[PDB]
Design a protein around this ligand. Structure first.
Ligand code: XTC
Ligand code: XTC
Ligand code: CL
Ligand code: CL
Ligand code: CL
Ligand code: CL
Ligand code: MG
Ligand code: MG
Lengths: 207, 207
């Protein structure tokens, strides 16, 4: 196998789907690429470095609404950007967990700066613009993680009684398991955006 | 060491703080309790069972605003409950990650049902009541996870250039690292609540 950056990442992503984040080891990556371990080490030093790179690559490859379009409202941008962020996390097993704890990479500086400038140009303080951005990110990460892990632990865990469930909770579970969690995510997303709009609009008024 | 349920959990939580979720093994738990492994197995069958129990115990012990007070508004309850949920997750290393993927335990049925009944009594459909509840949970889990993991990976990861940072992003990072992430969480929480209020209020009106 070829051992440049692109090829290693490609093989690491494939491996992530097969084994998940817990079972993604340097050993298994060397076996996957048909090489001895000291050969891999030349290229990739440890698991952390691998994961940091994957976090950046997943967004680079699949997160395609990272910038506002010409004349787009801040409401719209946040919605579209949240939707894009969600898809990209979803495309790989444990994708959301690969993201967790990372900060913007050098490769992402210009992009993330532009998002901050863009909010402030629309009348947000840097601070409220940051909070808006952060709340969308967190809401989105949380939604995705609960479902990615729920579906993962579905193997080991018993399942669910269903018999001695109370009636609202029973119907609640049927509703969350209906779809991705997409509905609940899109509805919760709108609440979040409208609340930022009410905050911005009010200015110094008591609200 | 005594080996009942209470004692095992107590020792498992202590261990979780020392090693985190990744390094919490049955082997190390047997060494911690001064026992051989087949002795532990009698009591605790595997890691998953352990973790499921911890998830439930952390909330039982430290999540103290799980119910509305007499005559409390739905706005207030959601706020207080989110704040309580956050603290409880924060009390242990990887606490939020211990929660992830779990569903309400038998021990939590009555409590979670009451929360659903409570929203519907305030004019939510079961469905919008569920979504409100879920969005708060996800927002809260996401916020906590990003900071718990950020602080964890702070050991392995280089750090941050700081030199070639763009200016808004530079000041953004100084702002998020100012505190827990508490400020950003509490502000994002208010936006979320007000947005649910706008949705509920409007009824069948276009909004
Ligand atoms: C944070 N608040 C909103 C609630 C809560 O306080 C408790 C609790 N035990 O007190 C919880 O169990 C809670 O944190 C929690 O984890 C929940 C769930 O996991 C959950 C609920 C309802 C439905 C699903 N579901 O997936 O279908 C859930 O995963 C109830 C919510 C209620 C959540
Ligand atoms: C989801 N939207 C809102 C943004 C985004 O689309 C990108 C991106 N590269 O396109 C991201 O890098 C993003 O997902 C992301 O992970 C971010 C961060 O990790 C992040 C940001 C600003 C500040 C911090 N911080 O901790 O201080 C962050 O952790 C920018 C946001 C912008 C986030
Ligand atoms: Cl080749
Ligand atoms: Cl090569
Ligand atoms: Cl004893
Ligand atoms: Cl005993
Ligand atoms: Mg991020
Ligand atoms: Mg839960």
């Amino acid at each position: 196998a070829r051992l440049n950056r692109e090829s290693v990442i490609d093989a690491a992503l494939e491996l992530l789907n097969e084994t998940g984040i817990d079972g993604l080891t340097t050993r298994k990556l060397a076996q996957k690429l048909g090489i001895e371990q000291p050969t891999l080490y030349w290229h990739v030093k440890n698991k952390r470095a691998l994961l940091d790179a994957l976090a950046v690559e997943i967004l680079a490859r699949h997160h395609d609404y990272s910038l506002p379009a010409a004349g787009e409202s801040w409401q719209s941008f946040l919605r579209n950007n949240a939707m894009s962020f969600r898809r990209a996390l979803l495309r790989y097993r444990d994708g959301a967990k690969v993201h967790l704890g990372t900060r913007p990479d050098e490769k992402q500086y210009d992009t993330v700066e532009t998002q901050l400038r863009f909010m402030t140009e629309n009348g947000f303080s840097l601070r409220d613009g940051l909070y808006a951005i952060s709340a969308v990110s967190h809401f989105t990460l949380g939604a995705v993680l609960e479902q990615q892990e729920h579906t993962a632990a579905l193997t080991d865990r018993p399942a669910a009684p269903d018999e001695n469930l109370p009636p609202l909770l029973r119907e609640a579970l049927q509703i969350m398991d209906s779809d991705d969690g997409e509905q609940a995510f899109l509805h919760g997303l709108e609440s979040l955006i409208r609340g930022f709009e009410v905050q911005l609009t009010a200015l110094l008024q008591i609200v």
